[PDB]
């Protein structure tokens, strides 16, 4: 009789790609979002500009 | 005069191919079998099916 070979997602090296976090009342959540804000470094032009 | 080179099967390396056993009742076995119980894994998928 054979046996199973259990694999855990964490021992897999691929888990580095994603940050899994458990969230128990996930089904109570409708379409949520995440925010962002970004600056842009600026150069000081000169003369004919 | 010449002599004969004895050879012992277990001292060969081909023995690692098969397991050997002594069953002196072999003349007394009818159609004989073995068994197997294997169980493959499975991954859960989404979708309508």
Residues B36, A44: Cα–Cα separation, whole Å: 78
Query: Which chain B residues are Cβ-neighbours of A5 within 8 angstroms?
Result: 41
Quick check: A2 contacting B, CB < 8 Å?
yes
Closest CA of chain A from B35, distance in Å: 9
Query: Which chain B residues are Cβ-neighbours of A4 within 8 angstroms?
Result: 39, 41
Closest CA of chain B from A29, distance in Å: 20
Q: Cβ(A7)–Cβ(B43) under 8 Å?
A: no
Place of tokens 């004989």: B32
Q: Cβ(B39)–Cβ(A4) under 8 Å?
A: yes
With CA atoms as reference, report the closest residue to B20 among B5, B36, B31, B8.
B8
């Amino acid at each position: 009789c054979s046996t199973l070979s259990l694999v855990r997602f964490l021992e897999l090296g691929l888990s580095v790609a994603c940050v899994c976090t458990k969230f128990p009342e996930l089904s109570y959540v409708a379409e949520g979002t995440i925010q962002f804000e970004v600056q842009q470094p600026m150069i000081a032009r000169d003369g004919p500009h």
